[PDB]
Each structure stands twice: as structure tokens, then as C-alpha cells.
Amino acid sequence: AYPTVSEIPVGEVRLYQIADGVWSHIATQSFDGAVYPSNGLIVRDGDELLLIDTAWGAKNTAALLAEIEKQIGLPVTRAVSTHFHDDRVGGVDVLRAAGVATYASPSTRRLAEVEGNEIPTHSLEGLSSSGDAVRFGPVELFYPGAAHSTDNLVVYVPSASVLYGGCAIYELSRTSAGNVADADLAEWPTSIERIQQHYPEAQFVIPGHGLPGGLDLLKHTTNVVKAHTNA
């Protein structure tokens, strides 16, 4: 069973195998007096790991490199951050100290820089317009347009039919919207449209927080987003 916020102390990381060669990683952090779970992804590429997103924090990110070593024993060589918030780029520095090459669209690198977060080293050319898609290691990086943020990328894994939303995709259990400071809620439902078109074979969808399910999360996410905006 997938882990939830109550089962994981701040500073510890769990790994959940979605598929052969494919894992989420789940951490917890204390943010605005509250305690939140958080997802990211790990994809096997040869004798090598691609890491999608930090574990939200330097401490949590060292911990995730350690659980990866213990449970998988392959080296993390690159990381992609799927937008500029601290739950996606915080720990980037631990990853770079460790030899990981860190990536992000240049939207992200800039926004990260303004907010004063940690900045991935390398730019992902090729995504600066909706529906754009590019291959990066064994996944496709797809840019759906503004949603959660102006820069959110989602990640698809064709080998396994695994779609990863980042925070642009809400878990099914979610009733209400999250951080909307940097969102554009009018397009968000159409960006989820583009996703739906590109990736209709997706057998697994992994929200940026909470439990994975199928492509129902997509409509469910748009449901949630519309409620918020009609209130």
C-alpha cells in the first residue's frame, strides 16, 4: 500500500515501485505549520537512475539518495525538476554535491532564481510552448501550458505507461485546491486537456502529492480546479 503522511517522519524517504524500472519517492515536510506528503519519481535507464524532483529539502534529499542506494543500488546521474517550487528544487544542491546533473526548463531556472530557491544547472530546450514534447533519457518531457504554474512539466514513461503530473495533477482524494499563488486556473483545465490527448495510453498517473491512480485523476483535477474558481 502507498504511504501516507502519517506513516513517514520528516527526514525519512520511502520508495514505491509503480513498475519495472519505475518508482515514486515519498517524503514529508513541515511547511506552514502543517505537515505534507510529497511525491517524485525515479526511472531506471541502463545501470543508471534518472530522478524526477527532489524530496523537498536538503535533509530529505540526502535521505532519498541513501534509500536509493540501499534499495536499488544504481547511481542517480540526472534529475529533472518539474517546476520552480521548493518541493521540486529544494535539495538540488545536495544532488549536485553528489554528482547529479540537475535539469529544468529555463522557465523554471529563472522563476527558481527569483523566488530565491535552488536552481538546476542545465536547461531543457524544447518545451516553451503548449503541447511541446521532447525525449530525455527514457522518458518524454511534455509541457501542457500553465496550470499549477506557468512552467509545470509532466513526465511520461513509455516503457511502463507511467504518467507523472507533478503538482499539476491532484490525487483523487483531494477536495480543494493547493498553492494557487502561481497558478492560472482558467487555462489549467485546458492544459489538462492537452495532457489527455498526448498520453491516452497512460496506465499510471502519479500526482505530485498523494496516491497514484489512472487517468481519472485528470478529470478529477479539473473538477477540483473548476470548483475553486466558481467559488
Ligand X SMILES: C=C(C[C@H]1O[B-](O)(O)c2ccc(Oc3ccc(OC)cc3)cc21)C(=O)O
Instruction: Provide the binding-site residues for ligand X, judged by CB under 6 A.
Output: 31, 36, 85-87, 167, 178-179, 181, 209
Whether residue 85 lies in the annotated active site: yes
Name the grid cell of 146. Answer: 500553465
Helix, strand, or coil (residue 183): coil
Interaction of residue 207 with Zn ion, rule CB under 5 A:
no
The one catalytic residue among 85, 86, 151, 209: 85
Whether residue 228 lies in the annotated active site: no
One-letter amino acid for residue 155 of the chain: V
Helix, strand, or coil (residue 42): strand
Whether residue 223 lies in the annotated active site: no
Q: How far is the CB of 149 from ligand X (least distance, A)?
A: 8
What secondary structure letter does DSSP report for 6? G
Q: Which residue has the cell 505507461?
A: 161
The whole-angstrom separation of Cα 65 and Cα 27 is 12
Among 55, 89, 124, 167, binds Zn ion (CB under 5 A): 167
Q: What is the DSSP string of 64-131?
A: HHHHHHHHT---EEEEE-SSSSHHHHTTHHHHHHTTPEEEE-HHHHHHHHHTT----SEE--S-SSTT
The one catalytic residue among 87, 117, 151, 152: 87
Q: How many helices (H) and strands (E) does the chain have?
A: 6, 12
Q: Which entry of Zn ion, ligand X, none binds 31, CB below 5 to 8 A by partner kind?
A: ligand X
The one catalytic residue among 60, 86, 148, 220: 148
Q: How far is the CB of 196 from ligand X (least distance, A)?
A: 20
Helix, strand, or coil (residue 13): coil
Whether residue 83 lies in the annotated active site: yes
Whether residue 179 lies in the annotated active site: yes
Q: Which entry of ligand X, Zn ion, none binds 36, CB below 5 to 8 A by partner kind?
A: ligand X
Q: How far is the CB of 48 from ligand X (least distance, A)?
A: 27
Interaction of residue 206 with Zn ion, rule CB under 5 A:
no
Interaction of residue 87 with Zn ion, rule CB under 5 A:
yes
Query: Which residue, 51 or 167, has its beta carbon nearer to Zn ion?
Result: 167
Q: What residues act catalytically?
A: 83, 85, 87, 148, 179
